[PDB]
Amino acid sequence: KSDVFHLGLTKNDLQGAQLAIVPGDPERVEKIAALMDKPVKLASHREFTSWRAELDGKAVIVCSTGIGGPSTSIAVEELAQLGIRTFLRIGTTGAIQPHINVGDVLVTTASVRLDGASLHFAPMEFPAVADFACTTALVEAAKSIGATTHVGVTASSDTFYPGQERYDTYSGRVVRRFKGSMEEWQAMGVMNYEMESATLLTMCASQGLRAGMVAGVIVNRTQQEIPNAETMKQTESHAVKIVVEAARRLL
Amino acid sequence: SDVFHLGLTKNDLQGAQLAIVPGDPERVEKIAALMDKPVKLASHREFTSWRAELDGKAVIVCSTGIGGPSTSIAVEELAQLGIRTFLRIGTTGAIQPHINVGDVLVTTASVRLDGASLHFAPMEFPAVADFACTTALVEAAKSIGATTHVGVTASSDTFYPGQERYDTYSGRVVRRFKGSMEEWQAMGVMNYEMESATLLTMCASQGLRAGMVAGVIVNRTQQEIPNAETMKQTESHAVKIVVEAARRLL
Amino acid sequence: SDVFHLGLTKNDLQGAQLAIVPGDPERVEKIAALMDKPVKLASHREFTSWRAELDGKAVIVCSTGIGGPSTSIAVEELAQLGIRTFLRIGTTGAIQPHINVGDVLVTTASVRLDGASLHFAPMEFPAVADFACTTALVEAAKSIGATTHVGVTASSDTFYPGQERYDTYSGRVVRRFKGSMEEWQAMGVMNYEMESATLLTMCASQGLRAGMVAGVIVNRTQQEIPNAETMESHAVKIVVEAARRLL
Amino acid sequence: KSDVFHLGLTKNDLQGAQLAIVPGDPERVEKIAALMDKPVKLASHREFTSWRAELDGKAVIVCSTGIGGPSTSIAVEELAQLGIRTFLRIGTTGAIQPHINVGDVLVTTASVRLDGASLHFAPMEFPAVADFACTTALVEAAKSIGATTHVGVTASSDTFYPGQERYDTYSGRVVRRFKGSMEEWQAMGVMNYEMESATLLTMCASQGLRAGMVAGVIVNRTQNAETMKQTESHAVKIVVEAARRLL
Amino acid sequence: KSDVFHLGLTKNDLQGAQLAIVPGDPERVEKIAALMDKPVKLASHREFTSWRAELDGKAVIVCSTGIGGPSTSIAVEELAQLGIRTFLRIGTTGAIQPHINVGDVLVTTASVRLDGASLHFAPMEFPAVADFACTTALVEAAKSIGATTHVGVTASSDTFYPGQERYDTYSGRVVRRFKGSMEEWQAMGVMNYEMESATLLTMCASQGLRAGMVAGVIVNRTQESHAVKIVVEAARRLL
Amino acid sequence: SKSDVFHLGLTKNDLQGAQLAIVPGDPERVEKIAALMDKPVKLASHREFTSWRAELDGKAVIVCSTGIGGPSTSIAVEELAQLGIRTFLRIGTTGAIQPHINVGDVLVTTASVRLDGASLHFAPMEFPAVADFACTTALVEAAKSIGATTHVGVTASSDTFYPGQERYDTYSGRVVRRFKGSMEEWQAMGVMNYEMESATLLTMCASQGLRAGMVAGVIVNRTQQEIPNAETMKQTESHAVKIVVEAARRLL
Numbered sequence A: 001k002s003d004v005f006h007l008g009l010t011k012n013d014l015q016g017a018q019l020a021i022v023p024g025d026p027e028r029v030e031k032i033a034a035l036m037d038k039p040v041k042l043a044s045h046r047e048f049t050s051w052r053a054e055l056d057g058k059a060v061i062v063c064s065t066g067i068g069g070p071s072t073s074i075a076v077e078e079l080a081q082l083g084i085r086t087f088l089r090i091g092t093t094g095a096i097q098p099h100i101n102v103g104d105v106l107v108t109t110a111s112v113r114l115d116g117a118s119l120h121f122a123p124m125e126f127p128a129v130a131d132f133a134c135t136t137a138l139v140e141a142a143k144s145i146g147a148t149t150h151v152g153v154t155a156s157s158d159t160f161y162p163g164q165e166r167y168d169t170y171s172g173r174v175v176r177r178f179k180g181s182m183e184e185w186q187a188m189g190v191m192n193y194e195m196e197s198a199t200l201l202t203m204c205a206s207q208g209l210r211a212g213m214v215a216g217v218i219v220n221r222t223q224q225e226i227p228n229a230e231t232m233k234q235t236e237s238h239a240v241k242i243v244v245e246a247a248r249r250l251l
Numbered sequence B: 001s002d003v004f005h006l007g008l009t010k011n012d013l014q015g016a017q018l019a020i021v022p023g024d025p026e027r028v029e030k031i032a033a034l035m036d037k038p039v040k041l042a043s044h045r046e047f048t049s050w051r052a053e054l055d056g057k058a059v060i061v062c063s064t065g066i067g068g069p070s071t072s073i074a075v076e077e078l079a080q081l082g083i084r085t086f087l088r089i090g091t092t093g094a095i096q097p098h099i100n101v102g103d104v105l106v107t108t109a110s111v112r113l114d115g116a117s118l119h120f121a122p123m124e125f126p127a128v129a130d131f132a133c134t135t136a137l138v139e140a141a142k143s144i145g146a147t148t149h150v151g152v153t154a155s156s157d158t159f160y161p162g163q164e165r166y167d168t169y170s171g172r173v174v175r176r177f178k179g180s181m182e183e184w185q186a187m188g189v190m191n192y193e194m195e196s197a198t199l200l201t202m203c204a205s206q207g208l209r210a211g212m213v214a215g216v217i218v219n220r221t222q223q224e225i226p227n228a229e230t231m232k233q234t235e236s237h238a239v240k241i242v243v244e245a246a247r248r249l250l
Numbered sequence C: 001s002d003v004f005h006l007g008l009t010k011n012d013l014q015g016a017q018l019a020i021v022p023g024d025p026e027r028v029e030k031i032a033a034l035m036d037k038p039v040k041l042a043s044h045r046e047f048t049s050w051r052a053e054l055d056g057k058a059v060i061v062c063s064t065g066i067g068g069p070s071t072s073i074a075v076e077e078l079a080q081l082g083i084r085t086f087l088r089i090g091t092t093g094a095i096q097p098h099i100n101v102g103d104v105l106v107t108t109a110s111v112r113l114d115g116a117s118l119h120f121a122p123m124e125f126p127a128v129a130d131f132a133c134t135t136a137l138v139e140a141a142k143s144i145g146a147t148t149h150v151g152v153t154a155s156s157d158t159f160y161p162g163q164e165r166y167d168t169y170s171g172r173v174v175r176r177f178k179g180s181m182e183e184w185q186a187m188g189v190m191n192y193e194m195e196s197a198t199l200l201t202m203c204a205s206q207g208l209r210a211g212m213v214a215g216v217i218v219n220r221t222q223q224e225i226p227n228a229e230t231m232e233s234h235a236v237k238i239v240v241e242a243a244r245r246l247l
Numbered sequence D: 001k002s003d004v005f006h007l008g009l010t011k012n013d014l015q016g017a018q019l020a021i022v023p024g025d026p027e028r029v030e031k032i033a034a035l036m037d038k039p040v041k042l043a044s045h046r047e048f049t050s051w052r053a054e055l056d057g058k059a060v061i062v063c064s065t066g067i068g069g070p071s072t073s074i075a076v077e078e079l080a081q082l083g084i085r086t087f088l089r090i091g092t093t094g095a096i097q098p099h100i101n102v103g104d105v106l107v108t109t110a111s112v113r114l115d116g117a118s119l120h121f122a123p124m125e126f127p128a129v130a131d132f133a134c135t136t137a138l139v140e141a142a143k144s145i146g147a148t149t150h151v152g153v154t155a156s157s158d159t160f161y162p163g164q165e166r167y168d169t170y171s172g173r174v175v176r177r178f179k180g181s182m183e184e185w186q187a188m189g190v191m192n193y194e195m196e197s198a199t200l201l202t203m204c205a206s207q208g209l210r211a212g213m214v215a216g217v218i219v220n221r222t223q224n225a226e227t228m229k230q231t232e233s234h235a236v237k238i239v240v241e242a243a244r245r246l247l
Numbered sequence E: 001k002s003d004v005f006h007l008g009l010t011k012n013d014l015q016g017a018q019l020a021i022v023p024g025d026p027e028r029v030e031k032i033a034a035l036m037d038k039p040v041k042l043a044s045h046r047e048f049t050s051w052r053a054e055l056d057g058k059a060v061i062v063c064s065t066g067i068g069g070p071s072t073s074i075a076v077e078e079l080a081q082l083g084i085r086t087f088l089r090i091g092t093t094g095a096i097q098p099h100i101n102v103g104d105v106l107v108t109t110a111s112v113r114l115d116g117a118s119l120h121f122a123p124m125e126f127p128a129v130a131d132f133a134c135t136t137a138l139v140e141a142a143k144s145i146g147a148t149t150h151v152g153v154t155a156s157s158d159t160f161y162p163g164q165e166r167y168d169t170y171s172g173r174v175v176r177r178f179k180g181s182m183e184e185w186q187a188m189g190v191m192n193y194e195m196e197s198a199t200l201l202t203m204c205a206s207q208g209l210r211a212g213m214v215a216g217v218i219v220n221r222t223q224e225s226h227a228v229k230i231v232v233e234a235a236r237r238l239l
Numbered sequence F: 001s002k003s004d005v006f007h008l009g010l011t012k013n014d015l016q017g018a019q020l021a022i023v024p025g026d027p028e029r030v031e032k033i034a035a036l037m038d039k040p041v042k043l044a045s046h047r048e049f050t051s052w053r054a055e056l057d058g059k060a061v062i063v064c065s066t067g068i069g070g071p072s073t074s075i076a077v078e079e080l081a082q083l084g085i086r087t088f089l090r091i092g093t094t095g096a097i098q099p100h101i102n103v104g105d106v107l108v109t110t111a112s113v114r115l116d117g118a119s120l121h122f123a124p125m126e127f128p129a130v131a132d133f134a135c136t137t138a139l140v141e142a143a144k145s146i147g148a149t150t151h152v153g154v155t156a157s158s159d160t161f162y163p164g165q166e167r168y169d170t171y172s173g174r175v176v177r178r179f180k181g182s183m184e185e186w187q188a189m190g191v192m193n194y195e196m197e198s199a200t201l202l203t204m205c206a207s208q209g210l211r212a213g214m215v216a217g218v219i220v221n222r223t224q225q226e227i228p229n230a231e232t233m234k235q236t237e238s239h240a241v242k243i244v245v246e247a248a249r250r251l252l
């Protein structure tokens, strides 16, 4: 029994939930859901793992999107069908600005559309802009936690390699369009790359859905250290604490 | 004297770092008179500039004229003079049935139906407002009890075809814009105006802060032409909001 | 009155079918004063409009302000008012080493580096001047004896990055425009300005006649901004003589 | 532990393999592997589950891509880093031609690029084309198996909904560009919609890698479970047999 | 021998010519040349047939381009290599405005770039604009010949069928882009369709060569000798 | 004057039931391709469109030139399809851009980089300029039958011979921004060669239910110094022509 093609969920399964937290990794779903009351596994199909839970007496969904806009668009669409109206994406990310450290938290106001799925919802002229309420909740939750936060634009790429101008690859080549592109995003003040927000934010802002995006900085292109596992795990839980507190303000 | 178009010098600004940029040169005077020590600085072309003081802090008011090109000149030369924050105040025609004339719109980002924004960033880049600025605008409109709508604005290089107006000399709109208004409407776009895409883009991609607020004068979905007195209170209302917002950003 | 921006009525025009359209409102009166019976009409925003008379015919002078968007407003509403021929007089930056400040440039067509022209025709459509208007402009220029250059113009939505000026706040220009000036120059492009692409496209694609002429106030192969200070009535007298031939 | 960032694989894991079969669904990896000799699990991370097997004494990889071009581009790139030079996508699909029925097998010569990831590898003018040897192998194996086979173009979309012009959705609207697009693909002779091939074929064709695609039609858009299953098993047999001819 | 790859012409063959009249049809070259002094056949390769004649004691070239921008661009480049600096195209065309009649002469000021080759010389933003002295000579020649002449914008298409929105084809299909395009061109005041001017004009205007465009109307979509005489007389004025 | 089509000057009767056409660019090459077949006979010649009929294993086959470029290619293909042709085999010569490809080698195109304008008149840029599988198979097999050294892959199809193939030895010596550094990119992407008709041919056929294939003889290598004389070039041309005819046999 399922009301949607991919997620293997019913409207009944949601228990009146209208907000979902949407990480990329199916394995981070339970860990996120465990921070709320009465966490319970719902379904798991392909890259879509969903759990339901409770915040302040209200039902909340946690569901993975997988990597990239296409699978993200499927989860967002099918959750919307089942009644979700607010989406909070939590992620990890690599920063392209020197002044941003591993451990910091990024809140995305809007994304550069280096994806394709967003164009399936709005013409490129349309802004991949986050919901103001969502962004406010995220920024506020970050501050009441004491996290060092940066708010601004994020480049959202359909690839991990060429679209983020990595040259350490099989071909060692990046297509004309992306040559010298990172230095250009940096000069334009772009904070980071990730791979889902352009699709998420465009498809929501153009369909009367609310969307927010927050991420933990676990690496920095422009820095020379690495550094290590324990801070990456620590920062991750920061962002996770943050997205849950934000969700609390939006219920 | 220092910049080509505005005819202003670094000295004229008095260490001012924030600017309110209306479109109408004739509205500059008024906005500035709402603050302490209003003083006229210059007037060239569509650029009239005044200095004023807000909580003891120098602030500039400078008209942009209609459209991205002249806006982009005003902002650039002001940034050259030290301005880092820009708050646009304007008038708009709502295109959502639920938005009544006299409402206040705060723009988080704009649909880029202009050309000047492309001179700063490729189309993929979001014409997104600065968070602090948008927050200040929202909190000002609320503290003043204005019915506020917060969302996306379609920013057009034309008043007529780009906003799909057919009541014209030619009566035709180019293919790309045939059926575009209903599209924007279905997408939740609040309104049309003609500067924010250039503004938000050129600021967000150059390390400058920008926000925009506007008062609704018309509604492309309602039939009653607005009351000549409501439009006036609304404008002064949007103007009250932008001035209050600037205080938070000083 | 009859229109949303200009504050004009058909009556104000007095049967005028031609308009001279400069950018700066503060020189509308100065152009009007070259003709007979100049009378100010209106002034709202960047649109200052005057009426004059040339060889016993009514002529309008109305400023566009800087850029296609306000130009598109002026042109459209003037058209509603009955204007069918538009002659733009402007200032410009030369990108060819041999063009002197004070020279008169007549534009056959423009490189569309704007956005407003796209609101009238797809990019494939040429931003081309009306041939009668261009002939009148060239013929009038030959009458005056001005050092004149005829050809293509780059029309930009910005004064700075779109014309590849680097002396700016950021000192950077977006990828699209890096090394663009050199390319227009190699293509034989004469100059930069900010309104002709919009004007010529919206007119050529709506059955309206349009001409374009400008005085050089900077050579960009030398510097980004004029000194200047400076101090071309030549282009202005040419646009008036031209309008004379088109009445 | 790992030579790549996502797949969690080292070169040793491939045991010299140069060919990978790439399904989308991580849970179909075992079943495909199970058709070959000495099938063994390798790793599972995110949507990337990988198995190794053997075909006529040669090491073969099966690795899922997840849904869509972005994750696909990661799987292919990292596998290429591990030494894979030939990629065969196996899939399920919905036909958009009236003459293409469920149970049929489609071999894709090239794809309509309705995705974003292909552009990170080559400009839009570049063909998202399959490698000829792979296509030959897939076609010949299908003929060997007796499958009703269609060889041609496929539409590859970054979405399952608007990009395939579905309206039975939360918004009930499809963006301008995709309005009436299905009927156009149909009149152009396009066989089907799926979600990975544009990325897969473009990134391979522009990087000296071989790629091909076969899929089973389980559904027709213009108009049961057990016959859906029996079809997939046949398209799966097809890809495995084609793999043999490419080793 | 030849100094160029396709035309099979030598610089010597031009005898100093600096102006070319460029028809589309190779079979039309001889006819045009025979309206001038001392017409001599030069070469004939692929769709490029070239003659030399003499006009007012000046060497002039007549060279066919074939149909379409690509071969047109080959002929122009290779003629420019041989010293040609001025190109006048003479063509046939279908008018798309009710007021233009078959037998009328059209002079093109600029073209809608519905082609590909023009993009090999300038970005789409660049106008496919004709040279002013050439357009002037064509317009003044038209008066001399006594032809009903319209001056304005031409739609230059890479195809004869779908790009001119013809549906009477094998497929009966025209691609999204060109569905409803003819009516829009008409509403924009576009005069006619043809297939070479966008390329010709763009490549000349962006490379410092002079080009002009004139054509006889052979059909009107809403329902050649003059044009040839005009192009020859205009060539006189440009020597 | 008896033609069912606007340009070609051909009637259906002329085809005598033919359903396949060989479509070279050069009008002068039509006669010589038909000469590899039985009972060849000239049908017509108008503009750059010269056509012959001939027999292959007892079946009527058309040979018709397209002229240089997608526009006249698009006319020749459309009007022949009207006449009944359903399969098109283009044979050309080409300049290779890969060092490993030798002059005299033969290229079979699986799909083309669309550096043309005519293709867009049949399908948006997203659509692949891809060859029919049967035709490509026929050409590859035929290449083996003849014994040619064959490469199969992607071709760059450009609307110009000069700036679009990044040639600088020109009147202007200028190459527009889009094409600056393009040959090096195509090379890096594995593209085999440049030519000027295939993007149009392949797109219009693949998006209109027609079959099309592309084979070419390499008469020059852009990466190499030495340029072969007409003798070895004519020799190359012969091989490709033999291959297109042999390939046609398998498609009848």
Ligand SMILES: O=c1ccn2c(n1)O[C@H]1[C@H](O)[C@@H](CO)O[C@H]12
Pocket: C023, C065, C066, C067, C090, C091, C092, C093, C159, C192, C193, C194, C195, C217, C218
């Ligand atoms: O380099 C120059 C010189 C003059 N102009 C210019 N660029 O653009 C034109 C603007 O409308 C206006 C802005 O200065 O004046 C024109």
Ligand SMILES: O=c1ccn2c(n1)O[C@H]1[C@H](O)[C@@H](CO)O[C@H]12
Pocket: E024, E066, E067, E068, E091, E092, E093, E094, E160, E164, E193, E194, E195, E196
């Ligand atoms: O509608 C028309 C009518 C005539 N022409 C045309 N389009 O294009 C020109 C081609 O060179 C050639 C193709 O028929 O003839 C010209």
Ligand SMILES: [K+]
Pocket: A047, A065, A066, A067, A068, A071, D047, D065, D066, D067, D068, D071
């Ligand atoms: K995925």
Ligand SMILES: [K+]
Pocket: B046, B064, B065, B066, B067, B070, C046, C064, C065, C066, C067, C070
């Ligand atoms: K203005």
Ligand SMILES: [K+]
Pocket: E047, E065, E066, E067, E068, E071, F048, F066, F067, F068, F069, F072
């Ligand atoms: K040709």
